[PDB]
Amino acid sequence: AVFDLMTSPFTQEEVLIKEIDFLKNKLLDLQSLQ
Amino acid sequence: SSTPLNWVQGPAIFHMLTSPYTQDEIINHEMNFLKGRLLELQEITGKKITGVN
Amino acid sequence: NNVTLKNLTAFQLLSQRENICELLNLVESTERHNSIINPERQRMSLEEMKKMLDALKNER
Amino acid sequence: IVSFLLLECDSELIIASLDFLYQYILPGSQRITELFKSKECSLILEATLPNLLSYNIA
Amino acid sequence: SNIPDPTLPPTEMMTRFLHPNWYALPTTVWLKYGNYNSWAPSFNENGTVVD
């Protein structure tokens, strides 16, 4: 895995929540594929 | 700064050693990575997930 | 039956080289050009067309 | 599109055709008339819809 | 050291080596719709390298 320091008007918590949402949807899609 | 910004350690991007250009090996390693990262982030945050297999 | 970068580049380069060598008249492709045309097959197909046309003509 | 309806071995194509026809005849009645004006579309729908009712349900 | 003797098998390096120049790129799919279904999409070329 790679981590890239960045900057945004969000905070770490909201970014982690968005990552959780996106990864959950992506895993659901990959599971539904098979 | 009219728009206050923060230092945000960004999200982990999936990086495979050998990129095989087809979807089979990619999807296998990617499902593994997704489950691992979901577990890591659930350990970091005070929350729970649904559908993790 | 499998296609990789090497196969694709080799195929494209082979086609290009064949075309250019044909431009300079450095190649004799009578075998290929007469297996594709196949004048025997031409005569066979022509006689088949004639027979089918006669059949359609006489059914009336 | 109704010919696409006539296939059997592609559920997604059938669902797409049915969704398009639904959205087509949805707003009013003149479009129903325009749809059934064609004899081919009418025949294919009449032969297909009841058999699509019992599609892959054993 | 833990290094083995140079006469113990295996002794070859590139026994399972694959260069990216042979990685089986994506191409067309060539679906098949029955036998009397000719008005049907035959290919599926979404992420293909060549048409």
Swiss-Prot record, chain A:
The gene is RSC30. It is found in: Nucleus. Component of the chromatin structure-remodeling complex (RSC), which is involved in transcription regulation and nucleosome positioning. RSC is responsible for the transfer of a histone octamer from a nucleosome core particle to naked DNA. The reaction requires ATP and involves an activated RSC-nucleosome intermediate. Remodeling reaction also involves DNA translocation, DNA twist and conformational change. Forms a heteromer with RSC3. Interacts with NPL6. Component of the two forms of the RSC complex composed of at least either RSC1 or RSC2, and ARP7, ARP9, LDB7, NPL6, RSC3, RSC30, RSC4, RSC58, RSC6, RSC8, RSC9, SFH1, STH1, HTL1 and probably RTT102. The complexes interact with histone and histone variant components of centromeric chromatin. Component of a fungal-specific module (HTL1-LDB7-NPL6-RSC3-RSC30) within the RSC complex. This is Chromatin structure-remodeling complex protein RSC30. Coiled coil: none annotated.
Swiss-Prot record, chain B:
It comes from the Eukaryota. Disulfide bonds: none annotated. It is found in: Nucleus. Present with 1750 molecules/cell in log phase SD medium. Forms a heteromer with RSC30. Interacts with LDB7 and NPL6. Component of the two forms of the RSC complex composed of at least either RSC1 or RSC2, and ARP7, ARP9, LDB7, NPL6, RSC3, RSC30, RSC4, RSC58, RSC6, RSC8, RSC9, SFH1, STH1, HTL1 and probably RTT102. The complexes interact with histone and histone variant components of centromeric chromatin. Component of a fungal-specific module (HTL1-LDB7-NPL6-RSC3-RSC30) within the RSC complex. Component of the chromatin structure-remodeling complex (RSC), which is involved in transcription regulation and nucleosome positioning. RSC is responsible for the transfer of a histone octamer from a nucleosome core particle to naked DNA. The reaction requires ATP and involves an activated RSC-nucleosome intermediate. Remodeling reaction also involves DNA translocation, DNA twist and conformational change. This is Chromatin structure-remodeling complex protein RSC3. It comes from Saccharomyces cerevisiae (strain ATCC 204508 / S288c). The lineage of its organism: Eukaryota, Fungi, Dikarya, Ascomycota, Saccharomycotina. The chain holds residues 152 to 204 of 885 of the full protein.
Swiss-Prot record, chain D:
It is found in: Nucleus. Belongs to the RSC9 family. Present with 2610 molecules/cell in log phase SD medium. Component of the two forms of the RSC complex composed of at least either RSC1 or RSC2, and ARP7, ARP9, LDB7, NPL6, RSC3, RSC30, RSC4, RSC58, RSC6, RSC8, RSC9, SFH1, STH1, HTL1 and probably RTT102. The complexes interact with histone and histone variant components of centromeric chromatin. Component of the chromatin structure-remodeling complex (RSC), which is involved in transcription regulation and nucleosome positioning. RSC is responsible for the transfer of a histone octamer from a nucleosome core particle to naked DNA. The reaction requires ATP and involves an activated RSC-nucleosome intermediate. Remodeling reaction also involves DNA translocation, DNA twist and conformational change. This is Chromatin structure-remodeling complex subunit RSC9. It comes from Saccharomyces cerevisiae (strain ATCC 204508 / S288c) (Baker's yeast). The gene is RSC9. The chain holds residues 292 to 349 of 581 of the full protein.
Curated annotation (Swiss-Prot), chain E:
This is Chromatin structure-remodeling complex protein RSC58. Present with 4460 molecules/cell in log phase SD medium. Component of the chromatin structure-remodeling complex (RSC), which is involved in transcription regulation and nucleosome positioning. RSC is responsible for the transfer of a histone octamer from a nucleosome core particle to naked DNA. The reaction requires ATP and involves an activated RSC-nucleosome intermediate. Remodeling reaction also involves DNA translocation, DNA twist and conformational change. It comes from Saccharomyces cerevisiae (strain ATCC 204508 / S288c). It comes from the Eukaryota. It is found in: Nucleus. Coiled coil: none annotated. Component of the two forms of the RSC complex composed of at least either RSC1 or RSC2, and ARP7, ARP9, LDB7, NPL6, RSC3, RSC30, RSC4, RSC58, RSC6, RSC8, RSC9, SFH1, STH1, HTL1 and probably RTT102. The complexes interact with histone and histone variant components of centromeric chromatin.
